[PDB]
């Protein structure tokens, strides 16, 4: 059948390498609501595309701040070019508000992808990502 994955959030291991850079998120790929099937593999922050075609890709990242803005980017990486492609961006300016806020950012769209492409989700600030439960921050893709 068709390549499908729904991935859920885990605790994020805060990396040191970020030169004005948006780090990728780590995902759960088999426990609870998380699954991958039909050659759609999750390894090392990427979702590996096994088969060329049109994919619906989606993610929500819930942010909590206890920062000017918050941003989610879903990114395509290929070996054929050194720079990634930004497929989707959801960026929201953070109101002065009260420094005890939470917000989801949701993205989903359809893209023509190629066998071998890697999909990942990047955030503006990893320490703002709510990782406490699998229903709040997730990432998925399926071949149409």
């Amino acid at each position: 059948d068709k390549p499908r994955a729904h991935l859920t959030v885990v605790r994020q291991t805060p990396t040191q390498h970020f030169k004005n850079q948006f780090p990728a998120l780590h995902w759960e790929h088999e426990l609870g609501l998380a699954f991958t099937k039909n050659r759609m593999n999750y390894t090392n922050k990427f979702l590996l595309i096994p088969e060329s075609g049109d994919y619906f890709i989606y993610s929500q990242v819930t942010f909590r701040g206890m920062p000017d803005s918050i941003t989610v980017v879903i990114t395509k990486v290929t070996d054929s070019y050194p720079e990634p492609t930004q497929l989707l961006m959801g960026t929201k300016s953070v109101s002065e508000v009260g420094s005890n806020w939470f917000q989801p950012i949701y993205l989903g769209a359809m893209f023509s992808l190629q066998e071998g492409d890697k999909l990942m989700v990047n955030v503006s600030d990893i320490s703002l990502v709510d990782y406490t439960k699998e229903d709040k921050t997730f990432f998925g893709a399926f071949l149409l």
Partner: protein, 109 residues
């Protein structure tokens, strides 16, 4: 003992099967021959109630910043989190209490 309806995988005779107790799950359903096989919940999984799941529930609650394990992931319950000693819960945010404050409530000056 709770019970559940089921139709046989070999030859579909509708028989009433035995529920599995907390800590267990239906590994094999009951047949005309044998009763229901309840297997133990695997690591980081639980069933809190008499059930007929074919798969245990995942311990899917991680404790955040300003948070500690109120209850560990057992085979009979999910993990639960309270705030740390320095903080109390409010609206979903574990925040400080200003002495001149229990994990549930703000104590005053």
């Amino acid at each position: 003992t709770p019970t559940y309806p089921w139709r046989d995988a070999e030859t579909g005779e509708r028989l009433v099967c035995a529920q599995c107790p907390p800590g267990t799950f239906v590994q094999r359903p009951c047949r005309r021959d044998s009763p229901t096989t309840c297997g133990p919940c695997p690591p980081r999984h639980y069933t809190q109630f008499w059930n007929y799941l074919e798969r245990c529930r995942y311990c899917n609650v991680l404790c955040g910043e300003r948070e500690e394990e109120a209850r560990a992931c057992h085979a009979t319950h999910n993990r639960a989190c309270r705030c740390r000693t320095g903080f109390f819960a409010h609206a979903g945010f574990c925040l400080e209490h200003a002495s001149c404050g229990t994990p549930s409530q703000n104590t005053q000056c």
